[PDB]
């Protein structure tokens, strides 16, 4: 286990989200669709990606609550249709303002906060407790493994060591 | 794909690593094994975890590239044994000083950046390009899926939008 309890997970979600969404404060609406060569996504596409995926994970849990046997990311799109799914995210939130996208993403992140609260320690942290989690596990590229063993723990274990320093180095 | 290209991946690896490893600069060696109730790991255990996993990913790649069989995660502990694996990491590496751990992890992160530089875009970002990557996916809990759809992209797409602003709002 890498998060110790649901409180720690919730705090990391909240704090990473705040750092992320704060960056869009200074972006003019007229530039929401501005694409540069150095970065693949526009500000609008950047936010739309988060709105799309956070909507889906909430849907999975909802559908599973209903007894639905959920193996697909969505209505329509395969686990091999992700490039097309991201495309779908972009048009669904196309011509939405940064302000509007931010409002919706805020709502989703809170819903996720509530989902964590409403989940016992067990269904959050033990295997085979949601069939959508099992199913979604059913192909990973090299770059995902690199991220999962560098960027991801370098973030979460940095939070851990800072908490250790708070208590130990006083 | 979430990362624009391999340089964007390498940048997030190096940036997140620098943030992480900087936290250990003011931890006295004498307190490296000090355990407290509020965090699950000591500073040496925290480092040892990273040393263990970064060593493994480098080993899987090296071994596969010379035509050897690769047993993931190890040839002794398989995937139902990650608690045992982490505990092996700690016996192997946590006895080392913070300075020694930091030297090894520095070297591993350097090697991972070099590995990324040396890989084609296809090998990094397409499925079924490494046997070790396919082998590693053949059970994830709910909390992992929550992290992967909030904390992880909130970090990665924050790096995107910060880069975007540096070019677009100069």
Numbering used by the authors:
A (entry chain B), B (entry chain A): 13 to 150, 153 to 184
Task: Give sentences from the paper.
The precursor PdDfsB is cleaved by subtilisin to yield biologically active Slf, and the chemical gradients of both proteins between two growing colonies could be accurately modelled. However, remarkably, the dfsB gene is widely distributed across Gram-positive and to some extent Gram-negative bacterial kingdoms (PFAM entry DUF1706). PdDfsB adopts a four-helical bundle core structure that belongs to the DinB structural superfamily. The most strongly conserved region of PdDfsB is the C-terminal helix, which is present within the mature Slf sequence.
The third, well-populated clade contains exclusively Gram-positive bacteria such as Listeria and some Streptococcus species. During purification of the two Streptococcus DfsB homologues (Streptococcus agalactiae and Streptococcus pneumoniae), both monomers and stable dimers could be identified. We attempted to crystallise both forms independently and only the dimers yielded diffraction-quality crystals. We solved the crystal structure of a S. agalactiae DfsB dimer (SaDfsB) by molecular replacement using a pruned CdDfsB structure as the search model. Interestingly, the source of dimerisation is via the C-terminal helix, which flips out of one monomer and inserts into the other in a mutual fashion.
